[PDB]
Every structure is written in C-alpha cells, then in structure tokens.
Amino acid sequence: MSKIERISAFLNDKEVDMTFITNPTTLNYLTGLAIDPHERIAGLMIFRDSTPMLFTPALEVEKAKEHTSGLDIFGYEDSQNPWEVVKNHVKSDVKSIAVEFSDIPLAKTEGLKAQFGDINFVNLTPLIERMRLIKSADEIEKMKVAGDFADKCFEIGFATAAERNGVTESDIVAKIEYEMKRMGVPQMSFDTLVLSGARAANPHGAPENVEIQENKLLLFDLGVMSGGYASDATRTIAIGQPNDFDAEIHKIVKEAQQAAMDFIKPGVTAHEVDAVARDLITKAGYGEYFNHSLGHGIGMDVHEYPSIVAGNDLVIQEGMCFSNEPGIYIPGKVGVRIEDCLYVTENGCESFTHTDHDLLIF
C-alpha cells in the first residue's frame, strides 16, 4: 500500500477536496520531514487526483526538497499572507478540507476560510491514528535504536548510583541525559525519573536533588527519541541489600510483567493482556496499589495506541507497539515498576529493551 494514497483514497471516500496537515509528527510520519515551524505556517496538501503539495516557511523550503518525496513543495516569505500564497498555488477550487482537529489552530483554520470561503472541515486524525497504529519494519528498526539507547541509559544510571558518595537523584538524571546528548540524542521522550525508596511509590513524584537511600530500591523510568521514534522503559533496582518486603514486591511486579510478556500474541485482547498482569498482582494482595493501565502504545510519541486497559477489547495484531509496565506503589514504603515496550510479531512479541528485570544489587 501507499500511505499518501490511503489518505487520497479517504479524500475520495469522503468527498473532501484536499488536506491541510499541520501536525509536525504527522508530516514526519507522512513524508520524512523533521520540521518545527513554531509560530510560522506549514501544511501538507494531499489531493483526490493531483500531485501532493508541501507548504513550508521559505527558509525551510529546500531542506524539504532534501527529504524529497515527490511532493511539489513551495514556501512563503515572512511578509506575504501565507494563506493568500496558498490560495494561489492551489489551482481551484476547494470546499472541503481534512485537518487534524487535534492540532490545527483556529487562526490557520481561519486563514484558509478567508481565501477559500465557507468550507467544511473533516477530521483526518482518526485515519492518521489508524495508520500509525501498525508499525512497518522500518518503523520497528528505528524504535529498536531508541530502545538500545534506553538500555545504555540503564547501565549508566545503575553504575552512577552504585558510586554513592552523596549522589542525588538529580545527579543520576543528568549523568544519564549527558551521555545520551553526547551520543547525538536530540532529547529524551519524557522527563527522566530516578525515584529512590518510598518516593518511587508516588507516581506523581519526579527526581529532586535528594540523596539516594541506602538499603532501599531505586526506580528508573527513561526513554530516548531516536529518528523521530520513541522508547519508554522502567527498571527498579536495589541500592544495597533490599529488605525482604520490597524484595517480594519486586518479585510480584516482575513475574507479572513477565507473564503478560509470555501472553502477548496476535489474537489476544488488550483487556486480556491487562488482565494477566493485573490478575496475578491482585491475587498477591496488591491490586489496590496498581491503579494505572498496564500499558500504552508507543511509536513517534511516547503515548499512542493501542491502550492496554481493562475496558478495551481490541484484538492485538501484528505490528502494534505498546508498553507492558505493571506496578505496585505502596505510599511511604516502596514503588516498583518494570516497563518494557514491545512489538507484536507474527507469532508473539519482541521487546525494544533487554536490560535484566531482576532485583540487582548495587
């Protein structure tokens, strides 16, 4: 199949003249263009039967020619009316435009009305989402790199905590993000969390500049962006010997996350995936301290679909990428979460991270 013709198909299905695709992730998804226009206008225009068009800001125009996807391309100088400029590159004649209802500002939506008239708008986002839901092999390979970087992050974070010597959570975080940015990593995919001890039991918490508690556990939630794709991974380890309680809390979570992993294959339902991790934890008595969903989808964002939640009966299919991250957070005592993100394969599933799941001691 073609991604752009799938959209084009949809346009003909819905009697929609063109699209004005504005979301940055979405343009990267559809064309390979990593562009942030900020205040200034950009938009991908896919037609029913007509060459697709790429409106970018003039300074951005030719490194959109680079990354060239048979797309036409044209810009505007920070002086003309973007919308006027676009009305005249479109040679007649528009009454319906599919837009990303999620993303498109009402100014952009009003610029187009000014030049094109009383137009209908149709929400492209659901199709985009449906497309993004299943990852092609290129997409999977780029995610595995992000996952590699996460595993590299765990080594760093573990090593850096073992050294103690008054080391704080903030210290861990920075040393991790430093080695990452050092290796060309453009940014993390979410705020790195190092939570020590009872503070890990607060899912609200974030790393402060506090010392690491000895003989307690330490939570590690981190992820990289690599090539516009996301990784998300958690590990909890022991700084020093654990107490026999937090050690079993880890065991329950760990088997839980491992049992869900052994379960996942095409045919199962997210609800059932959630149920496997959930049922074995509640059985152990901790169900009341596991009050987020088992997982979220991952791709170009740390959060997309499918959602692995009790209500959701979606049948898991080959190519879906989602996390699997059970937890037990006992306010004031311990918090343990073991997060892997995986991809469903023809026969089961494979993981994007590979660090040991065991309660390692440092």
Interface residues with Mn ion (CB under 5 A) are: 221, 232, 323, 325, 339
Contact between 222 and 340 under an 8 Å Cβ cutoff? The reply is no
In whole angstroms, give the CA distance from residue 287 to residue 43.
Answer: 46
Residue 204, interface with a second copy (CB under 8 A)? yes
Residue 36 or 118 with smaller CB distance to Mn ion: 36
Is residue 272 part of the contact set for a second copy (CB under 8 A)? no
Q: Are 337 and 325 in contact (CB under 8 A)?
A: yes
Q: Is 102 in the site for a second copy (CB under 8 A)?
A: yes
| Cα 113 to chain centroid, rounded | 33
Pick from 320, 310, 334: nearest CA to 253: 334
Q: Which does 221 bind (CB under 5 to 8 A by kind): a second copy, Mn ion, none?
A: Mn ion
Member of 32, 203, 227, 319 binding a second copy (CB under 8 A): 203
The reply to whether 13 sits near a second copy by the rule CB under 8 A is no
In the bound state with Mn ion, the residue whose beta carbon lies nearer, of 17 and 232, is 232
> d(Cα 277, Cα 137) in Å, to the nearest integer?
28
Cα atoms in the 13 Å half-sphere on the side-chain side of 179: 16
Looking only at residues 156 through 185 of this chain, which bind a second copy when binding is defined by CB under 8 A? 170-171, 173-175, 177-184
Binding mask 232-271 for a second copy (x = CB under 8 A): ----------------------------------------
CA nearest to 250, candidates 208, 201, 205 = 201
Contact call for residue 311 and a second copy (CB under 8 A): yes
Q: Output the smallest distance, CB 112 to Mn ion, in A.
A: 30
Amino acid type, 185: V
The answer to whether 225 touches 28, Cβ cutoff 8 Å, is no
Binding test (CB under 8 A) with a second copy, winner from 137, 291, 313, 346: 291
Residue 118, annotated ligand binder? no
Q: List the single partner that 61 binds among a second copy, Mn ion, none, CB under 5 to 8 Å by kind.
A: none
Helix (H, G, I), strand (E, B) or coil at 54: strand
As annotated, the binding site for Mn(2+) includes 221, 232, 296, 325, 339
